[PDB]
Structure formats: C-alpha cells, structure tokens
Amino acid sequence: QMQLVQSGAEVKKPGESLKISCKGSGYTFSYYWIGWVRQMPGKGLEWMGIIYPGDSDTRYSPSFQGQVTISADKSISTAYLHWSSLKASDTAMYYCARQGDLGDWILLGYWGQGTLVTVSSASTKGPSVFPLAPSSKSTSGTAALGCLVKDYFPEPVTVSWNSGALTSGVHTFPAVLQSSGLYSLSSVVTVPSSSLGTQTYICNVNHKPSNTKVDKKV
Amino acid sequence: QMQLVQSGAEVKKPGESLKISCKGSGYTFSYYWIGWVRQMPGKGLEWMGIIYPGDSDTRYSPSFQGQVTISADKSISTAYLHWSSLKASDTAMYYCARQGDLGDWILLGYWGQGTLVTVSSASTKGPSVFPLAPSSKSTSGTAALGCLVKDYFPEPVTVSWNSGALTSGVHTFPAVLQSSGLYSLSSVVTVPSSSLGTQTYICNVNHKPSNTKVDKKV
Amino acid sequence: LGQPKAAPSVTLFPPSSEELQANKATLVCLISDFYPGAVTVAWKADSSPVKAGVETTTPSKQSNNKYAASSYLSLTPEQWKSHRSYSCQVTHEGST
Amino acid sequence: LGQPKAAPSVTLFPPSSEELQANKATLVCLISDFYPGAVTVAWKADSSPVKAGVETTTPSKQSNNKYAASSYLSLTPEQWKSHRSYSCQVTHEGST
Numbered sequence: 028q029m030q031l032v033q034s035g036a037e038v039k040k041p042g043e044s045l046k047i048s049c050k051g052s053g054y055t056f057s058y059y060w061i062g063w064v065r066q067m068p069g070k071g072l073e074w075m076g077i078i079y080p081g082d083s084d085t086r087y088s089p090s091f092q093g094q095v096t097i098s099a100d101k102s103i104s105t106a107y108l109h110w111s112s113l114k115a116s117d118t119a120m121y122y123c124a125r126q127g128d129l130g131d132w133i134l135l136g137y138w139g140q141g142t143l144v145t146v147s148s149a150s151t152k153g154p155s156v157f158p159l160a161p162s163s164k165s166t167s168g169t170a171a172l173g174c175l176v177k178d179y180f181p182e183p184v185t186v187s188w189n190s191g192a193l194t195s196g197v198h199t200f201p202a203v204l205q206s207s208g209l210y211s212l213s214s215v216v217t218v219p220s221s222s223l224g225t226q227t228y229i230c231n232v233n234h235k236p237s238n239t240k241v242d243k244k245v
Numbered sequence: 246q247m248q249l250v251q252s253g254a255e256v257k258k259p260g261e262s263l264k265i266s267c268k269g270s271g272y273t274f275s276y277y278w279i280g281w282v283r284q285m286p287g288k289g290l291e292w293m294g295i296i297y298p299g300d301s302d303t304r305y306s307p308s309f310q311g312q313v314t315i316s317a318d319k320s321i322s323t324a325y326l327h328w329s330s331l332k333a334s335d336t337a338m339y340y341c342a343r344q345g346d347l348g349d350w351i352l353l354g355y356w357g358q359g360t361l362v363t364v365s366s367a368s369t370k371g372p373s374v375f376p377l378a379p380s381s382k383s384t385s386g387t388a389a390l391g392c393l394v395k396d397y398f399p400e401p402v403t404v405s406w407n408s409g410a411l412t413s414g415v416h417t418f419p420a421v422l423q424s425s426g427l428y429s430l431s432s433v434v435t436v437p438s439s440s441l442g443t444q445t446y447i448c449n450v451n452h453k454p455s456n457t458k459v460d461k462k463v
Numbered sequence: 464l465g466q467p468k469a470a471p472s473v474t475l476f477p478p479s480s481e482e483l484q485a486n487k488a489t490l491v492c493l494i495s496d497f498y499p500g501a502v503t504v505a506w507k508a509d510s511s512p513v514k515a516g517v518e519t520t521t522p523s524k525q526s527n528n529k530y531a532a533s534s535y536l537s538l539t540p541e542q543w544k545s546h547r548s549y550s551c552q553v554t555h556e557g558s559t
Numbered sequence: 560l561g562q563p564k565a566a567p568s569v570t571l572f573p574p575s576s577e578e579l580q581a582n583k584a585t586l587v588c589l590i591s592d593f594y595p596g597a598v599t600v601a602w603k604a605d606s607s608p609v610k611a612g613v614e615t616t617t618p619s620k621q622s623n624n625k626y627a628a629s630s631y632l633s634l635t636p637e638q639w640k641s642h643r644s645y646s647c648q649v650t651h652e653g654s655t
Contacts, residue, residue: 419618480580
C-alpha cells in the first residue's frame with residue numbers, strides 16, 4: 028500500500044537551520060516527482076519546488092529559488108526539505124506530494140499528513156488573570172462574572188470554570204492581536220443576580236507553553 | 246535517660262473539652278509526684294495541682310479545686326490534664342514537672358517541653374497574601390520587597406522565598422493579635438536597588454491548618 | 464445558507480480592580496449574538512470620541528451561524544478616575 | 560549591660576495593590592534594629608493625629624540581643640486617596 032509518512036512537529040527559532048523529511052513507501056521511488064507545498068495559517072497553498080528521485084533535476088518556484096533547497100535520498104527512498112536562516116514569516120504548514128499513475132507530471136494526486144513549522148520570534152509573556160467583577164452597582168438583569176486573560180504571546184489558551192464545571196452560560200471569545208504582539212481574550216458566564224458566588228465562581232486559566240497554573244475567584 | 250515528652254499544640258474554642266497528655270520515661274513512674282504549672286503570657290507561674298502515680302492522691306490549688314481535674318495512667322506511664330467548659334482566660338502555657346532524687350516532695354526539679362494551649366472565639370480562615378510593592382517612586386537607599394500575610398487564625402505561619410532560597414536579608418517579624426482575633430505578620434528582604442527582581446522575587450507562604458499553598462511574585 | 468438577522472449585545476464591564484489599582488487600565492466590551500459580521504466599536508469619554516489604543520475583530524463563536532466581537536480600550540488608571548464611566552457603542556444598525 | 564544602643568530603622572511601605580483592590584486598606588510600618596524594648600507608634604494624617612485601628616507590639620527578633628516592632632493601620636481605600644501619604648513616627652528616644 029502506497030503511503031507518505033512525514034516527520035513530527037518541529038518548533039525552533041529564526042536563525043537556525045531546519046531539515047524535515049517525508050518518506051514514501053509502497054511504490055518505486057525512482058520515477059515519481061516529489062515536491063513540497065507551503066500553506067500559511069489562513070492562506071492558500073504555495074508551491075516551492077519539486078525534485079526527481081532518479082537524478083538531481085530541481086525546478087524551484089521563482090519566489091523560492093534561493094530561499095529553500097530540496098533534496099532526497101534514493102538509497103533509503105526518503106525526501107528531505109532543508110532550510111537556512113529561518114525568518115519570522117516561515118511559520119506555515121508543509122506537505123509532500125507525488126504524481127499518480129495518471130495525469131500530468133506535476134499533478135500531485137497523492138499527499139501526506141503535514142508538518143507544522145512555527146518560529147514566531149517574540150517574547151513569551153506569562154498570562155495575568157484579572158477577575159472581571161460583575162455590575163455590583165446595578166444588579167438589573169442577569170449577573171455576569173468572568174476573568175481577563177492578558178499579556179500572553181501563545182494564542183492557544185484554555186479557560187475553564189470550577190475544574191470544568193458550569194458548562195451552560197460560559198462563552199469563550201477568541202483573542203485579538205494587539206499592537207505589541209500579545210493577545211487578550213475574555214470569558215464570562217450568564218448567572219442569575221440572586222446567585223452571586225453559588226459554590227465559588229472561580230476562574231481556571233491554563234497555559235501550556237509557559238506552564239502557569241493560575242486560579243483566582245471573584 | 247529521664248525525659249518528659251508532651252503532646253502537640255492544641256487550639257480549641259471556648260465551651261469545648263480538652264485533655265492534654267505528658268508522658269515520662271527513663272525512670273520508675275510509680276513514686277515520683279507529677280504536677281502541672283500554668284504560665285500565662287507575660288505573667289508568672291501558676292500551680293494547679295499534683296498527682297501520684299501509685300494511688301489517686303490529688304492535692305489541688307485552692308484557686309483550682311473544681312476548675313480543673315488531673316489524672317494519670319500508671320499502666321502506660323503517662324499523665325493527663327483534662328479540662329471542662331474552657332473560658333477565654335484559660336489560654337496559657339502548661340508544663341509537667343516531677344520531683345528529683347533530692348529535696349522535698351514538691352520540689353519539681355525536672356520539667357517538660359511545654360504545650361501551647363490557646364482558645365479564642367474566632368474560627369480558622371485561610372490567609373490572603375498581599376505582595377508589598379517596593380518604593381518604586383523613591384529608589385534612594387536599598388530596595389525592600391515582601392508580602393503581607395493577613396486574615397489567618399492559627400499563629401504558626403512559615404514564610405520562605407524561592408522555595409527556601411535567599412537566606413540573607415530576609416527578616417520575619419512576629420504577628421500581632423488584632424481586635425478581631427486574626428493575626429498579621431510581614432516579611433521583607435533587603436536587596437540592592439539595581440537588582441529589582443533578580444530571578445523572580447516570589448513569595449512563598451504556607452499554612453498547615455488550612456492547607457493553602459499561595460505562591461506570588463512582586 | 465445563512466441565518467436571519469439578530470440583535471448584538473452591549474455587555475460592558477468596568478475596569479477590574481486588580482488591573483485598575485495597578486499602573487494599567489483596560490475597558491472590555493462584549494458584543495455577540497449578532498449574525499451580520501460587520502460592526503465597528505467607537506469609544507466615547509463623556510460625549511467625546513476617543514480612539515486611542517482600541518482594537519476590535521469579528522470572529523465566529525460556534526456552529527450557531529452567528530458571529531461575536533470584542534474590544535479593548537487600554538489607557539492609564541489616572542485617566543479612568545478623571546472622568547465618568549465610559550460607554551460602549553455598537554453602531555451595528557442603529558444607535559444602541 | 561554593655562550592649563550599645565542602636566537607632567531604630569524606619570521602613571514604611573505604601574499600601575499594596577492586592578490589598579487595595581476591594582474596599583480594604585492597611586498601612587504597615589516596620590521598626591527594628593533597636594536595643595531598648597520600649598517604643599510606641601503614632602500615626603499622623605497630614606499633621607493630624609489619627610489613632611483609629613492601630614496595634615503595636617515589641618517582640619524579640621533572634622539572639623541578636625535587639626528587639627523589633629510592627630504596626631498596622633487599617634482604614635478605607637477612600638480615606639487613603641483623600642489625603643497625602645501617611646507618616647510613621649517611632650518616638651523611640653527622639654523625633655524620627
């Protein structure tokens with residue numbers, strides 16, 4: 028069975044080389060053109076270049092001529108993708124494709140799994156939780172309690188209530204990219220005004236890239 | 246070797262029974278008179294009564310005839326001190342003494358380690374750590390950073406820095422008994438002004454009776 | 464296909480005490496439960512338009528076919544106590 | 560006798576932020592490095608004596624043969640912002 032296996036996720040910093048791999052099996056790795064396709068988060072597909080397993084016949088994209096080099100090892104039937112002097116704009120998803128038994132020589136009918144590269148050279152700030160106090164001066168309507176997550180570089184941030192309790196009412200809003208490069212989101216919960224602090228009404232914010240366990244009530 | 250070991254510190258509320266113990270070893274616990282001496286904070290010694298391990302021959306103080314009862318267990322060689330209907334003025338330091346090989350039968354040449362007995366109407370409550378920000382508006386001299394521990398009933402509270410680091414400069418001040426019955430202490434460290442937050446300058450406050458692990462930086 | 468129109472939210476929280484007492488301040492206005500993904504948030508300080516340090520996006524909440532919004536007004540804590548409570552204007556379809 | 564007298568150290572910290580978030584305030588004045596175990600702390604609010612909610616003791620620090628002191632002035636956060644910064648008076652032997 029023909030299948031393409033790639034390397035795991037690699038997290039590095041700009042100014043350091045990177046060489047991912049993508050091995051193909053189940054077919055003769057001498058006649059099928061191997062290439063790479065770049066996909067930025069939220070953008071379309073971007074082609075960089077292709078290689079031939081038999082002999083070195085490399086045709087790179089006009090916008091990726093000297094920005095990236097592609098190579099392969101015919102002895103082990105594995106293709107590589109080497110980088111040099113990475114930049115902050117190189118964070119994107121990369122795939123390895125090959126031609127099929129029918130179509131053109133750059134049809135790229137088959138694909139792999141995907142190797143996510145991210146450098147994003149910045150300052151990883153620790154998230155500071157600020158409990159958003161409800162409208163204690165005007166209890167007209169329904170009470171709303173929450174916490175303010177701010178000053179954090181990594182976008183993925185999970186926020187729960189009472190170790191995962193209180194499923195109904197909690198609505199998590201996506202963060203916004205500020206000018207300083209740090210994101211900020213807010214999560215509240217719609218609760219009756221007569222139920223101020225039922226059990227604890229405590230926030231639970233977790234941050235994996237920094238390993239900060241901050242728990243604060245309101 | 247003759248030695249007297251007592252029980253741990255007991256903290257209760259007025260209107261509750263209490264029975265502390267004090268075990269003696271290293272000698273024949275059948276002929277040495279055992280007694281108890283009360284010492285109020287800032288006051289002198291107060292004798293309550295004595296007991297005999299062989300037979301129950303109790304001679305109580307004229308001011309402590311029915312106010313307190315003393316007992317012992319000859320089978321395990323341990324003396325007891327049971328209370329009934331404690332009051333607000335019963336909080337004091339209690340010792341267990343025994344007669345020596347020379348002198349009178351109430352000489353009490355040997356003593357124990359001491360058991361801290363405190364009683365108050367207030368209940369236990371977890372302390373709230375407040376990071377005392379240094380003099381950022383006036384850096385003249387040496388910087389001083391610390392945290393404010395307040396609103397805690399139990400007196401024993403251990404405060405460390407960086408999981409026990411920064412031994413020099415830290416000076417822990419004893420707490421003060423407020424009118425509400427809750428204590429409050431403060432611990433600061435003398436650091437140079439040009440070294441604001443060397444590694445983390447994080448406080449570490451531990452509270453065993455409430456099991457509250459509060460770690461916060463400043 | 465889409466979903467019929469709805470009414471956005473005007474949820475506005477005052478500056479939290481933990482950030483207000485510090486050398487910082489941030490006004491958080493929550494806008495959600497609206498289908499048309501087109502809304503511009505304008506801040507005012509006692510009938511005076513102020514647009515210093517404001518960012519607003521329009522993401523998608525969930526598969527409920529409606530979008531959400533969030534705005535943050537960063538300023539100094541002394542500026543908050545110098546005037547009254549700020550107001551959050553949605554300008555989705557009309558004055559709200 | 561034989562222990563020389565030492566001037567007490569004055570270290571008055573402003574009210575912290577985490578204690579000033581809600582309706583709470585506490586002034587903390589640290590006095591230490593003095594041999595004579597006799598000192599009374601007097602608080603003043605812009606040349607006006609204030610003795611509302613003040614407690615002070617004189618414990619022993621360690622085997623260094625000198626004593627320490629601590630005072631706490633609890634009040635409302637509105638009272639703190641109504642005047643200037645408070646002052647801590649030692650009155651150990653003279654005006655300090």
